[PDB]
Amino acid sequence: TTALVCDNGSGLVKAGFAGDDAPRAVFPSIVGRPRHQGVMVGMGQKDSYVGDEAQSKRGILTLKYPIEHGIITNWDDMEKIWHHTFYNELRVAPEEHPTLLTEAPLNPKANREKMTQIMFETFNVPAMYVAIQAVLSLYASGRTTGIVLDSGDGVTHNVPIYEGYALPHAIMRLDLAGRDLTDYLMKILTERGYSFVTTAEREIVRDIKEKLCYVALDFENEMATAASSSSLEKSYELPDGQVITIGNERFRCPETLFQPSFIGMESAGIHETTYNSIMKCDIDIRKDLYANNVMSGGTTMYPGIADRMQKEITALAPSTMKIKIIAPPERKYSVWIGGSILASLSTFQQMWITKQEYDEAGPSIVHRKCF
Amino acid sequence: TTALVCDNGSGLVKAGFAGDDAPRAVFPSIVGRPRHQGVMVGMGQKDSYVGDEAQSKRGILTLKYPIEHGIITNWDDMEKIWHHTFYNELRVAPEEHPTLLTEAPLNPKANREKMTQIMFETFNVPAMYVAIQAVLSLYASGRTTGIVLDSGDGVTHNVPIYEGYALPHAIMRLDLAGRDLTDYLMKILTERGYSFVTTAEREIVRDIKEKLCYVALDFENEMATAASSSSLEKSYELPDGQVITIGNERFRCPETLFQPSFIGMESAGIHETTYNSIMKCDIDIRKDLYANNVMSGGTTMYPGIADRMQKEITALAPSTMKIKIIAPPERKYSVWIGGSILASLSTFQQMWITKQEYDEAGPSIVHRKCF
């Protein structure tokens, strides 16, 4: 039987089959509800719109994210996301197809418990697995050793692996990713005059961030360049036809990833997080983590981030070590591609959490069987 | 059992059955009462005249409109209008047929209370319902989304509806329509030596407004053209035999719709009211609404109004928007046609306000049941 990989990220659900190269169904994880009064009777008036339909009719909908910082808050909304991504996107029956899910490290355990219980009682499977995203990213990079910075839409985590042995005391989680960048861009877009308050306008500011934003190599020189001349300014067309023009806010929005104190967080940026995750490891393997800095996630999809990361780690590391940022062009879907490796591996077939094991051991086998 | 549709506008009652294309009875809502000393005994003398008979003998009658700006003041006159349009015009029993009535938005509630009370106690029905006219106009246009500018004889209102979901905070109401234009034409027809002060003469000035008037594409150029040459001047024959000739007053009378400051009103024109009702909506849906300007009512029956409205909205909107105005040739009765859409729907059978629910909850259930 062919398997399913369903990366339930905070922003974008990426679901599809096993053995494929690209994910079949990429759609954002929002649940929309109508907030006005319907006057036309009938017309297929649904009480809820899930996914890209909620992207389409978004001017009359309140959009709720079921996932915040890797932790599923609303569980009926997550059931609606899973029902949509099984029955509408893929059009599959989960009773005859295995499923691998991805999970951030340092997650609360009851999230995994309710994920296992919904996947075994509501959408009950022959088998399923819950894995760590950084192991799948290092699978898709094609190497055995390396440190992975995975930054989705809620969770930025650094996990180092040497020779297939992960070090659990060096795992570093930071709750700063693209949704906080979207909220900070909504905060700083009001400086120029453009106001975005609703949940519908969050998608517009997210589209502005996806199309126009980039990581600056030097923040002070780019701020002096944007203050001096209007060469870095770019224009964008809104859905109502109005045209906006933004300047330094193209690079101030991803600069929260290297300076969290803009949004009031005490913790350091991603480069010192990666450097402290390197320095928490044992002393022999650090050189083998210095040359294999694998990036993944959509938030590392800016076209300035690899050279900035190389500059900051080269500033932090000793000078006699080679810093090599592994940045593949397909790093956005890469965790899914790692699942398409790991579902296809012949040695993984004994590592399924079967239904008989769940019915024997309760919902307690998921802690001792997984990581 | 077929339903009944009875649009009780400020100027013309349009009544008929459901399922029919044309309105069966279109007649003005006037009540005539005699104002002179009757000297011949007998001869079929009536104390009241309603409708076309009151139009026939209008030289010796005082005509009263029971509805002014959507608010019915004289209620015995309105009972005579309803008794005439049930027993004489339509000749049907109101005890065996449901009756839908229409209503302007932001109408006073006691009008709906007394309408429900007279429909349930004087002309007691199986059921009744109070609906919005712009929903029926958008039904008659055959679409789901769109902004509706309805303009009858008293009320001109803009209602935007997106995907069957109306926006109640964006509904705009203006008390300026064809009766005020008839009074303004009565004011400006005294410039050329023609005096019209009685209520009988208001029908003649309304016939002059219906027949000869048109909307100028540019007001200043057409005024300079009419001041320069006598090419736009037209002649009309009065029923006694006199001939009048008018020039610029063909396009000064419907210019008050686009410019209310002629008749001393602080409100802006209908194009800026339509633009503000678009701009009060959410930012995602405006590209539909600019493509779906829907006009209805007889006051939009001038043969110059759509090009002027397109020029004004095209000047107001940004240049990347397709300004489309849907003005069907049957837009004078289309609201009634929309009632014949809604009363013949199979899903509207559950939304009637019955006799038993009225006797349970008093005459106050029509607020919670309707819009």
Next chain:
Amino acid sequence: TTALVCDNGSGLVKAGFAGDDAPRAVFPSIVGRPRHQGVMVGMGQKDSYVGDEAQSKRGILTLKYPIEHGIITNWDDMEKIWHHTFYNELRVAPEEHPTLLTEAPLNPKANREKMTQIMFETFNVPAMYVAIQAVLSLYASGRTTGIVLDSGDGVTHNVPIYEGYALPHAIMRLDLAGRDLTDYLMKILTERGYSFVTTAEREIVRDIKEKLCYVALDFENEMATAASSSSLEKSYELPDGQVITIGNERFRCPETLFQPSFIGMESAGIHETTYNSIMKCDIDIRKDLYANNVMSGGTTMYPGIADRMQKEITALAPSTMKIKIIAPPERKYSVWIGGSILASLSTFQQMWITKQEYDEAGPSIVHRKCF
């Protein structure tokens, strides 16, 4: 040299000297223009009336508000407001008196640019400063820690401050205040038959809201009580002598502050805004923020709002917290009183933005110097 405090609010300009308890010049910010044809020659017919004169002759004027939601749109009208509030009300030379101004948080920066440019070029002061209103309200409360909800005529903002250290990532701005309540009362007064459409009638509806309206402790029990008996109904005399009587609209008007979905806004009420601004803060200051809820602004001047605010925050907070809504009776002018503190402090004298610093650094020092 005695300083000046000029709170340019959205609805009422409050200006006066420093060192004083009560504001000397409190007058609404409206610019009137005549919309009718003047026929009497001479007699000092001004083309514009500013302030209380615009309140006096408002039957023949169109009144324009130069400030909408804290953002000054019309700048020549704002220059007329500033020229009237310096030369006519205060009767002071602006070039010999420093003038602190107030500003809403999360304002567009070009408003601050043009405010600094007009305050340094047209009315060329020796020095000025732009501050935040909530810090002035926490000055006038006498304390140091606390969260301030300042609600004026355009802007309702929540700002938390602990020990003189604000948290700018928890400042929450909501564009819902007393002008939206005045427009909502203008919308809901049409149910009873009273129509108010012009800008002259908006002052009458605002005076009705100031005199008769109050905040319900519970909305549903008050609605059932007003629906049951006519004990809550009150009367008011119009300037033409007609007497109006209102019932539940006394408490339906400020209930939009706790339920914004009455006017079609997606965001939550002011109590949920205060609770989310408390929960956005760090944890160890939170017990200090629950006990110091300081309220200011005229929109918090209803005689039911402190008990409703205490009930809603105690419903949202955990049960072992001492909720204490600080509601002084002088909270309508209290922001100005805080300006009278901050202009009179000995340590503030080094924090003026001078003329020489403006001429050195352009109109760009107001972002770097102010907060």
Next chain:
Amino acid sequence: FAKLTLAFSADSKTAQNLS
């Protein structure tokens, strides 16, 4: 006790929118 032993033993949418 017998019930305790037995219990605890160890299309329309498209037709609507068209019309």
